[PDB]
Structure 1
Amino acid sequence: MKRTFQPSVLKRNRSHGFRARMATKNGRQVLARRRAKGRARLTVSK
């Protein structure tokens, strides 16, 4: 049984990383929402 989560750090950062978020107007609104909510981890960047 292959499951849905097949981790890959490169794909993770290219898909949801900080620079991926900053690339688009909508990704920068994700960061604004998570900053407003007070999220300790802003992105998947560690």
Structure 2
Amino acid sequence: MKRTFQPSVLKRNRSHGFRARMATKNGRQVLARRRAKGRARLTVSK
């Protein structure tokens, strides 16, 4: 079939990337809710 995950790096870095988390002020709180619980995979940039 045509399954759910169809992978693309140039879409993933623009959707769930760090510079995607950049401009949205409601996303700065998301980064500040991952740093302040201390995860290793902060965002899915590589």
TM-score by length of 1: 0.92
Two-structure CA RMSD over aligned residues (Å): 0.7
Structure 1, residues 9-46: CA drift from partner, whole Å, max 9, x if none?
00000001001101100111110000011011110101
SS in 2 for 1:36: helix
The share of aligned pairs that are identical, in percent, is 100
Structure 1 residue ranges (4+ consecutive) displaced by more than 4 angstroms after TM superposition: none
Aligned residues: 46
TM-score normalised to structure 2 length: 0.92
Gaps of 5+ in 1: none
Return 5+ residue gaps in structure 2 as ranges.
Answer: none
Q: State how far apart, in whole Å, the 2-side matches of 1:3 and 1:29 are.
A: 32
Report the Cα distance in structure 1 between the residues aligned to 2:27 and 2:16, rounded to whole angstroms: 9
Q: In 2, distance between residues paired with 1:7 and 1:30? A: 23
